[PDB]
Amino acid sequence: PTRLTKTRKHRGNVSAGKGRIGKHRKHPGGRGKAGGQHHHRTNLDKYHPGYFGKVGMRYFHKQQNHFWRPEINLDKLWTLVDSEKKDEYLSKSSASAAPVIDTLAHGYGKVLGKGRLPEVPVIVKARFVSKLAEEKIRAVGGVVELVA
Amino acid sequence: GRDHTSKQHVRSGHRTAPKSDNVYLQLLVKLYSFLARRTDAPFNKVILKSLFLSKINRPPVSVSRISRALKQKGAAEKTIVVVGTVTDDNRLLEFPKATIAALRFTAGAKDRILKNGGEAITLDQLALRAPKGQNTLIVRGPRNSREAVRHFGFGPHKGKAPRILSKGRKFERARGRRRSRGFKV
Amino acid sequence: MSQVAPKWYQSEDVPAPKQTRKTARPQKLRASLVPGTVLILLAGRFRGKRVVYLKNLEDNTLLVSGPFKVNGVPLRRVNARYVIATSTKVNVSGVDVSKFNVEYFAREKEIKAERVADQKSVDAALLSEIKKTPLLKQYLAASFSLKNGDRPHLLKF
Amino acid sequence: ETLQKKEKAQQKTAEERAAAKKVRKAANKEKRKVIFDRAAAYQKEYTEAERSVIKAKRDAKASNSYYVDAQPKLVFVVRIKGINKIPPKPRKVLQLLRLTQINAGVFVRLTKATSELIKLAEPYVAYGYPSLSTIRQLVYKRGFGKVNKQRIALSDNAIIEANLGKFNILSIEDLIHEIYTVGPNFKQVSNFLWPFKLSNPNGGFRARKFQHFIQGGDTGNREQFINALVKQMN
Amino acid sequence: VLKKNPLKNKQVLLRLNPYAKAYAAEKVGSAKVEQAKVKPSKGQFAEVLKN
RNA sequence: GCGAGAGACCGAUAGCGAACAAGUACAGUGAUGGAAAGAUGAAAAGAACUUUGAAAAGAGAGUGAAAAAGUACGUGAAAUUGUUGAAAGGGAAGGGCUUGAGAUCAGACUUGGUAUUUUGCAUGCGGUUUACCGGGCCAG
RNA sequence: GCCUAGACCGAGGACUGCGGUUUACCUAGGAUGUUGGCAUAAUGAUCUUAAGUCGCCCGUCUUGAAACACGGACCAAGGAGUCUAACGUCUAUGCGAGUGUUUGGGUGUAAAACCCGUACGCGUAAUGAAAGUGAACGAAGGUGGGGGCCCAUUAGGGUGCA
RNA sequence: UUGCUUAAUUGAACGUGGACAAUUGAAUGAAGAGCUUUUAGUGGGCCAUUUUUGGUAAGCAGAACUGGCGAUGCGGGAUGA
RNA sequence: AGCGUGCUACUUAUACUUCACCGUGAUUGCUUGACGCUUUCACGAGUAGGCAGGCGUGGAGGUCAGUGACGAAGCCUU
Numbered sequence A: 001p002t003r004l005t006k007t008r009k010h011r012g013n014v015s016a017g018k019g020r021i022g023k024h025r026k027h028p029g030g031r032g033k034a035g036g037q038h039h040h041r042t043n044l045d046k047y048h049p050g051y052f053g054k055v056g057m058r059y060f061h062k063q064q065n066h067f068w069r070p071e072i073n074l075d076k077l078w079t080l081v082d083s084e085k086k087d088e089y090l091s092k093s094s095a096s097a098a099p100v101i102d103t104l105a106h107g108y109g110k111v112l113g114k115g116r117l118p119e120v121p122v123i124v125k126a127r128f129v130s131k132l133a134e135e136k137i138r139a140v141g142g143v144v145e146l147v148a
Numbered sequence B: 001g002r003d004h005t006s007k008q009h010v011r012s013g014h015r016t017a018p019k020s021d022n023v024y025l026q027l028l029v030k031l032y033s034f035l036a037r038r039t040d041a042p043f044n045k046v047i048l049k050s051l052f053l054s055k056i057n058r059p060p061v062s063v064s065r066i067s068r069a070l071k072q073k074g075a076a077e078k079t080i081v082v083v084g085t086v087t088d089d090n091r092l093l094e095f096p097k098a099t100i101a102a103l104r105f106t107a108g109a110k111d112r113i114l115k116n117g118g119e120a121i122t123l124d125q126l127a128l129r130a131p132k133g134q135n136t137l138i139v140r141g142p143r144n145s146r147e148a149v150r151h152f153g154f155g156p157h158k159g160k161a162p163r164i165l166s167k168g169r170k171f172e173r174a175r176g177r178r179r180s181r182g183f184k185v
Numbered sequence C: 001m002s003q004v005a006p007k008w009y010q011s012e013d014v015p016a017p018k019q020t021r022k023t024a025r026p027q028k029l030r031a032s033l034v035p036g037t038v039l040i041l042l043a044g045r046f047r048g049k050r051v052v053y054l055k056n057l058e059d060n061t062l063l064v065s066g067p068f069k070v071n072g073v074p075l076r077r078v079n080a081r082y083v084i085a086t087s088t089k090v091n092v093s094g095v096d097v098s099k100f101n102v103e104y105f106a107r108e109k110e111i112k113a114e115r116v117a118d119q120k121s122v123d124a125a126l127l128s129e130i131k132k133t134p135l136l137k138q139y140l141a142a143s144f145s146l147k148n149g150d151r152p153h154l155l156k157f
Numbered sequence D: 001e002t003l004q005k006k007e008k009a010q011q012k013t014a015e016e017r018a019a020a021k022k023v024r025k026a027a028n029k030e031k032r033k034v035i036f037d038r039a040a041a042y043q044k045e046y047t048e049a050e051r052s053v054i055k056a057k058r059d060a061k062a063s064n065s066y067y068v069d070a071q072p073k074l075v076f077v078v079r080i081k082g083i084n085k086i087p088p089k090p091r092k093v094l095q096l097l098r099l100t101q102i103n104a105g106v107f108v109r110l111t112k113a114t115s116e117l118i119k120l121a122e123p124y125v126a127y128g129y130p131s132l133s134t135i136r137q138l139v140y141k142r143g144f145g146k147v148n149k150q151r152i153a154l155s156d157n158a159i160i161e162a163n164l165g166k167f168n169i170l171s172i173e174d175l176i177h178e179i180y181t182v183g184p185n186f187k188q189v190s191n192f193l194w195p196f197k198l199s200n201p202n203g204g205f206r207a208r209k210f211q212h213f214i215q216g217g218d219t220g221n222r223e224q225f226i227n228a229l230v231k232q233m234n
Numbered sequence E: 001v002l003k004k005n006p007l008k009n010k011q012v013l014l015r016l017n018p019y020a021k022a023y024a025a026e027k028v029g030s031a032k033v034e035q036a037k038v039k040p041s042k043g044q045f046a047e048v049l050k051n
Numbered sequence F: 001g002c003g004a005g006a007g008a009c010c011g012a013u014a015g016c017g018a019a020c021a022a023g024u025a026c027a028g029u030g031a032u033g034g035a036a037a038g039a040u041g042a043a044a045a046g047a048a049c050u051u052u053g054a055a056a057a058g059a060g061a062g063u064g065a066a067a068a069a070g071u072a073c074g075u076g077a078a079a080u081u082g083u084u085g086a087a088a089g090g091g092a093a094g095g096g097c098u099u100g101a102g103a104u105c106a107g108a109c110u111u112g113g114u115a116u117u118u119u120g121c122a123u124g125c126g127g128u129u130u131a132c133c134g135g136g137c138c139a140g
Numbered sequence G: 001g002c003c004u005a006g007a008c009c010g011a012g013g014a015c016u017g018c019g020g021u022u023u024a025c026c027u028a029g030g031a032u033g034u035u036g037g038c039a040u041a042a043u044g045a046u047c048u049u050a051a052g053u054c055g056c057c058c059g060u061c062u063u064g065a066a067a068c069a070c071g072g073a074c075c076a077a078g079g080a081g082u083c084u085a086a087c088g089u090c091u092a093u094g095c096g097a098g099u100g101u102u103u104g105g106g107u108g109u110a111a112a113a114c115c116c117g118u119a120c121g122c123g124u125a126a127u128g129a130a131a132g133u134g135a136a137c138g139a140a141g142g143u144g145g146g147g148g149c150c151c152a153u154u155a156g157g158g159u160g161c162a
Numbered sequence H: 001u002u003g004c005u006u007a008a009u010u011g012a013a014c015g016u017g018g019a020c021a022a023u024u025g026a027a028u029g030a031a032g033a034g035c036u037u038u039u040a041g042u043g044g045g046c047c048a049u050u051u052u053u054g055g056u057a058a059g060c061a062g063a064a065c066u067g068g069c070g071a072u073g074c075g076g077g078a079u080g081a
Numbered sequence I: 001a002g003c004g005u006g007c008u009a010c011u012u013a014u015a016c017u018u019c020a021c022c023g024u025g026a027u028u029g030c031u032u033g034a035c036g037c038u039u040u041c042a043c044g045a046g047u048a049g050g051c052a053g054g055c056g057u058g059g060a061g062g063u064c065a066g067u068g069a070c071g072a073a074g075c076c077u078u
């Protein structure tokens, strides 16, 4: 709303809050990112270091679909188990019958190993796993089955 | 005339009321305005002050933090007070039976507290079973995990997060972050 | 003025006054005011008249007589602050002024018969004592005025 | 019928209040006897000390000696200069003496630290050695206490007791005694006292204030003529 | 509500200092001193007069 | 372009340049440039007649709810101007504060109570004036 | 200790307190008593004017303006920090490890309201130029503080979120 | 306690346990202390005392500390930042 | 009624003292208005500039079953 702005309160005061000496001018200092190496160097060096220059190698025609590999951690892995059947599984899982968690079908590429698992065997199907994620799954008596 | 040793006509700098116009939040302060005014219990003066705080000053409290707070020695039946929303944590393997008093509960949090034999009550229900806050334990959420704080106090050799819209090798990584490209700060 | 209605909590009851501790204590007249002293009236109809002081009434006023025969100023009250008390004195030990009080001068053209009779009876004794001092009648029958070069801060009365 | 209900309640509570005031007044009588005895003891020791010093002076005169008086331990400092154009160090010193307005007065116990403080404020203050009666007149007419950061008149000994009873001050005369003969708790008693706000002198200052009292001005140490000045200003 | 000067209001003076009553009763303000009529400066203190 | 329905838009210096005989009048050799300008009244009932005047017109009269609506047309502000009235004014005027003087305005005899003399109305209601109780304000 | 002249003021509004004189009274937590006059008015306000005193033309840039610095003869109407795309802080709100119905589909009393979901965006993982790798020694750590809560009994101890 | 140090059982740092209780170790003051985010205007200055440089000097030019004017009316200096 | 110097009294700033009222900050208490009532103290200069609380205008949703041709709006006026 225009009625709540300070433009309405500056009516009657000569300079409208812009100053009598400094005044409001068109573009003192330049337009946009002008002067980044000369008189706005003090700003870019302090608040945006690394702005100028090239680092690393280019990639012509980069398709981000090649690099799609969403992560799921171990502490969030049991949320892919059916919610209505999670509690019985946490009890009745064994080497003879452990739940299969198809992580690729839930939209994940790599299983990572942050957090702690239930001391319960599980069969985890993943495209990729980390060394510790698979060590923690095997320690609770589970296994990782590679898919594609 | 006076030689002022301090600034004159200075507001206290603390909220004396909620900024919110929620009529039900002001009814709770009306209860705790009365309690802070009349019980001499330090618990009630803290709650009245905490009801004024803003949203960023009332971070969500996960039900896992309450689980860790209930795991203190001699704290299994203390009553947890959260002036704000209590959220769920799907990373828990288990939750105890507990009484938790909060402004709000999420669906996962309320289901999990009651599923494990606990209670999810409001702060007015607390004021009747504990008008002096006896045997309570106030839980506050993490204030510094917010994203805006990542960029607070940014500067050379300060180790904070730049305020930037895109992330990658072409975005503020060359000169001033690397000795091969001049200097590093 | 505006359309702001009065509210229900705007009461109309008038509080009682607090209990006041201004207990009055009696007036102290000037040392020059002793009954029988001749006074000069400064204000009112009889301003400038020299009159005889008789009694201190309980209303803080002074009972005064001309005498009426000498002056034409009757028995009446004056305020002590509108009188200059001279040093001339008349022996009023022989004048009975007991029946005179505030209710005597109560507000009710013509003049009551009681009051005229009392005027004559008081004026008889005042006159009997006034004749003794020569020129006291002449002085009382004469009006007071400030002549040119009269300084009341330097004059003795 | 609310008339008789409310009348009965005030008269019942009035009788209860009357009984409570009886017990309170009976209890308060002993405390007032205590403070009466204290004031009498203070007066006796004042007179005896005065006569003792006088006798010692006469004896030293008789015995071909010179009795040198004990140096004054207390001073009353009045800021007689406005608040404009004050250098930073004396401005800070005057603020630390609680002299933040013109015609503000404060009590100072003479040590070395406080003496060098007053030396810094010397071009802006008139100070001196106050008599007992000057102290009493100041505390009685313009004596105020700082209670929860408020300037409250010392109109009843209960205010003084409630704020300085942990320092054995139960009366206005205990406070005056503690100030005059600088007592073990002079600091607390003088800081509890709000700075005295005096008027201008009846009779004026000298022709030009802001020069030392020795050179015909008003600033600096005037020692016993501060009593005449306080009489002018209080 | 109104500060009253104990140096003008006698009731306030007695409220603050009960010993003022005894001061008034004993005429402590005009108390005589009992002493002998002596003059101890007859000797060497006349060094003030001349030297 | 054609045909429709709409709008927290603008309301005749606005909204398209144009609400009107507006891309008009007019300017420029020319390309081009380009306005101003809406409102009597429900209805002309747009004032017959008489009179003065060379005439425009004016005065009577007439129409109209209104002519304080007469095509100079609803309302008709200010600048500016005439007349009347009031006032001031020795090389400006104008202003603040204070009081005087003149003009204007305001307010408690209250929604005053008790009766009462005494009267207009529907035993009772409104007025009125004399008494007493009491009240308002300014003062000693 | 005592007597005495004048000025200004009278905030408050049942009682409650501290004292003084003796379950009473007072000068002691803020003015009452009494009398006169006025209500066609004493009283108060405004306007105009006279008198006394003070008062330079505003706005502007400027260290500095009444300036011999600039605009302004006068009046009316108009007249200048907006909207949008993308963002920072703070705040309110809904839901919350998720969140966002409105691209679209359904529906409709039809640009409204009501309803729907796959995807997608942001978030839930970082780091390295990249190939790549990828977050619990421990009750998700220890120490010194730390509000609140618990046991105590000045003190002291326990538990200690942010 | 240690992977550092000493010829060492010597030391270094950080510790467990014990002793020293409100005069817990000068004065004065403290409308309390600590902490965070965000943003305006500004980035021509000038003056007075004192120290002071260039200059014959200047109502000149340049520094040091403070206080002022600017940004501030009021009483005084007739008038005057 | 000049110069140096001493003395007594007197004159008056928006400064100081006591009081009233306004606002701001704090502060005491308060179980059909607590976004309210109440006790108390201190403080009040301000360009550029920040913030707060308000006054006014065109139009919009709701309401006052609001005003109005028995006179709305506009306009002039001690």
Ligand SMILES: NC[C@@H]1O[C@H](O[C@H]2[C@@H](O)[C@H](O[C@@H]3[C@@H](O)[C@H](N)C[C@H](N)[C@H]3O[C@H]3O[C@H](CO)[C@@H](O)[C@H](O)[C@H]3N)O[C@@H]2CO)[C@H](N)[C@@H](O)[C@@H]1O
Binding pocket: B147, B165, G121, G122
């Ligand atoms: N998906 C990228 C863009 O996101 C935009 O929307 C972004 C903004 O509307 C919104 O901005 C939030 C801000 O509100 C909030 N208070 C803080 C938060 N950091 C901001 O998010 C920001 O950071 C994220 C990365 O973390 C960026 O992807 C985003 O563009 C940027 N605005 O968060 C959204 C996250 O993307 C637009 N939908 C569009 O330009 C585009 O889709």
Ligand SMILES: [Mg+2]
Binding pocket: A009, A010, A013
């Ligand atoms: Mg403004």
Ligand SMILES: [Mg+2]
Binding pocket: A013
């Ligand atoms: Mg301004």
Ligand SMILES: [Mg+2]
Binding pocket: A014, G059
């Ligand atoms: Mg202007």
Ligand SMILES: [Mg+2]
Binding pocket: A016, A017, A018, H040
């Ligand atoms: Mg601005």
Ligand SMILES: [Mg+2]
Binding pocket: A015, A019, A020, A023
């Ligand atoms: Mg400008």
Ligand SMILES: [Mg+2]
Binding pocket: A019, A022, A023
């Ligand atoms: Mg600028």
Ligand SMILES: [Mg+2]
Binding pocket: none
């Ligand atoms: Mg990556």
Ligand SMILES: [Mg+2]
Binding pocket: B001, B002
């Ligand atoms: Mg002030």
Ligand SMILES: [Mg+2]
Binding pocket: B145
């Ligand atoms: Mg974290």
Ligand SMILES: [Mg+2]
Binding pocket: none
């Ligand atoms: Mg580092």
Ligand SMILES: [Mg+2]
Binding pocket: none
């Ligand atoms: Mg780029």
Ligand SMILES: [Mg+2]
Binding pocket: none
């Ligand atoms: Mg190098």
Ligand SMILES: [Mg+2]
Binding pocket: none
């Ligand atoms: Mg290179």
Ligand SMILES: [Mg+2]
Binding pocket: D203
């Ligand atoms: Mg005098």
Ligand SMILES: [Mg+2]
Binding pocket: none
């Ligand atoms: Mg047009």
